[PDB]
């Protein structure tokens, strides 16, 4: 009987552990994807800032 209880508890524990790991990993992955995409857009804004800065360095000529 105690072995039966031990196996039920083991099943519950590892169900919980694997699900928690999966949800943590998914949160990390989606966060990294968004972050990469946000920083890419920011670098794009930067190139935009650079070129608009450049326009001011030719009119003074």
């Amino acid at each position: 009987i105690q072995k039966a209880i031990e196996e039920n508890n083991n099943f519950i524990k590892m169900a919980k552990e694997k699900l928690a790991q999966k949800m943590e990993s998914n949160k990390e992955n989606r966060e990294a994807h968004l972050a990469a995409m946000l920083e890419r857009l920011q670098e794009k804004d930067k190139h935009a800032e650079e070129v608009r800065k450049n326009k001011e360095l030719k009119e003074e000529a």
């Binding site: 009987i1 105690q2 039966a4 209880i5 196996e7």
Partner: protein, 424 residues
């Protein structure tokens, strides 16, 4: 000499209810527990199975056990529902799911103490208990597992009292689930260790009798339980009626069991019913020794009789009976062992059963009972070699090792029967 009765599970409770109906009728007790019979031969030995209650009502010394309330709902509602002591209905609510592990190890263990309490409170009111009888099936979970657990516990608490069982063997021809060979195999080992006598009632034989002989095309469990109750009444006849010998359960077992493990009997009955013709003594004996009249699906000619007891019931000439018995033996004497002198005994009860003017009950301790265990074993192995369905049991805490042990003990039991079939 008081007897305590226990019925566990669906089959156990159904067969026990029928048995109590039958013997209450024979003893003249009505469904209210009031005696309205017409002879004191009905009462001289009535304390064996009934307690005397206030108002001198008679209450069966019976404990009803199940892990679900269904069958005991029906029992408490049925013909003789209100005769059983209300405290003696001990039930759980979940069930055993036709799982031996649930009845023996998990769900049953939660209730076995509650059952043993009632067993004890019935034993205390016994002037001198001679033993217990249990009715149950081996193919389900409650009867099968929980009843074997109860037998173990009773042996622990009452180590020096006789424990006998009427055990219904599973058979594919009339089957509820496929795991029946497993449960059966695990129960039989328990019985081999913990019962003084086990009367093997094979549903295969009951179905074949109800179909081929009584000519019932679609037999129900009621039609088989009719035969089972008839046999149970026959077996216990010598203890319930006064004209007979002076033997308690222990004496009968002593004279019927030459070896401890080989205590599995082949019941038999004649005539088979479900007519008005007065049946003759020669026909009674011939049918009684006919394999087609026996409750275990084994051929007695494929084995040898260690001991035989026959109880005739009705008004007949003991001279004619005893001539016909000596006929059937001295004639076919190659199926009786020569190393147990005078191993056939016959009792005649002057009171008949109801519906029948002459009946004979056959109790045979034959080595042909092998054929049942090998059957079960085969079924067992046919699944166990693929671990099939084992997940039902491993999930309740059992190890494959246990299945292997149960298989080995029964193959041993078969082998022991082979040993005493060749002996000369």
């Amino acid at each position: 000499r008081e007897i305590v009765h226990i019925q566990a599970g669906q089959c156990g409770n159904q067969i026990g209810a029928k048995f109590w109906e039958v013997i209450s009728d024979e003893h003249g007790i009505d469904p209210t527990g009031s005696y309205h019979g017409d002879s004191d031969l009905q009462l001289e030995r009535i304390n064996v199975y009934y307690n005397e209650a206030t108002g001198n009502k008679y209450v069966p010394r019976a404990i009803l056990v199940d892990l679900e309330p269904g069958t005991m709902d029906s029992v408490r509602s049925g013909p003789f529902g209100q005769i059983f002591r209300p405290d003696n209905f001990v039930f759980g609510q979940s069930g055993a799911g036709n799982n031996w592990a649930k009845g023996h190890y998990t769900e049953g263990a939660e209730l076995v103490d509650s059952v043993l309490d009632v067993v004890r409170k019935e034993s205390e009111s016994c002037d001198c208990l001679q033993g217990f009888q249990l009715t149950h099936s081996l193919g389900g979970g409650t009867g099968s597992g929980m009843g074997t657990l109860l037998i173990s516990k009773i042996r622990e608490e009452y180590p020096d009292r006789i424990m006998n069982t009427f055990s219904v063997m599973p058979s594919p021809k009339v089957s509820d689930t496929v795991v029946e060979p497993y449960n059966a195999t695990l129960s039989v080992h328990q019985l081999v260790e913990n019962t003084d006598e086990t009367y093997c009632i094979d549903n295969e034989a009951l179905y074949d009798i109800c179909f081929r002989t009584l000519k019932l095309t679609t037999p129900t469990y009621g039609d088989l339980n009719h035969l089972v109750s008839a046999t149970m009444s026959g077996v216990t006849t010598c203890l319930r009626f006064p004209g007979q010998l002076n033997a308690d359960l222990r004496k009968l077992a002593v004279n019927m069991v030459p070896f401890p493990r080989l205590h599995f009997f082949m019941p038999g009955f004649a005539p088979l019913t479900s007519q008005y013709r007065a049946l003759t003594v020669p026909e009674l004996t011939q049918q009684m020794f006919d394999s087609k009249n026996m409750m275990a699906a084994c051929d007695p000619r494929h084995g040898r009789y260690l001991t035989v007891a026959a109880i005739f019931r009705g008004r007949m000439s003991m001279k004619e009976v005893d001539e016909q018995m000596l006929n059937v033996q001295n004639k076919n004497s190659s199926y009786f062992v020569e190393w147990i002198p005078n191993n056939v005994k016959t009792a005649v009860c002057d009171i008949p059963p109801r519906g029948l003017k002459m009946s004979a009950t056959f109790i045979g301790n034959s080595t042909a009972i092998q054929e049942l265990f090998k059957r079960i074993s085969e079924q067992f192995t046919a699944m166990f070699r693929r671990k099939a369905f084992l997940h039902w049991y491993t999930g309740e805490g059992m190890d494959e090792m246990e299945f292997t042990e149960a298989e080995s003990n029964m193959n041993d039991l078969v082998s022991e029967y082979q040993q005493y079939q060749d002996a000369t």
